[PDB]
Design a protein. Structure first.
Length: 120
């Protein structure tokens, strides 16, 4: 015995299920923010077409953090147990906030960046 029907449907601005960027994984950090926003912003970005992740992964190429400094995020990075093939980018929410209003991965002139081991 068995039965069913199920249904389908799709409607959007040319984007049924094709992440705009297949190399723009943005990871929002709850620390110094919360869930609401974290999830919100994270969801907002996705809506733009970005590939946001609830949990850190090797796919994470960009890590967002509000208030937190590149150091704070860094220390956390090392604190993580996930292995990354290439250290992700650390930028302030200001980037994610823009990346949204920009619907694209705004350029990183630095202001967006939190901090890095840059000397020279």
């Amino acid at each position: 015995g068995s039965s069913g029907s199920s249904g389908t449907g799709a409607l959007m601005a040319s984007s049924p299920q094709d992440i705009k960027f297949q190399d723009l994984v943005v990871f929002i950090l709850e620390k110094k923010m919360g869930t609401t926003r974290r999830a919100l912003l994270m969801e907002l970005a996705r809506r733009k077409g970005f590939r946001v992740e609830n949990e850190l992964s090797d796919s994470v190429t960009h890590i967002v953090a509000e208030n937190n400094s590149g150091s704070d995020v860094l220390e956390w990075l090392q604190a993580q147990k996930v292995q990354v093939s290439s250290q992700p980018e650390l930028l302030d929410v200001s980037w994610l906030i823009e990346c949204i209003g920009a619907g694209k991965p705004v350029e990183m002139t630095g202001k967006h960046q939190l901090s890095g081991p840059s000397s020279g």
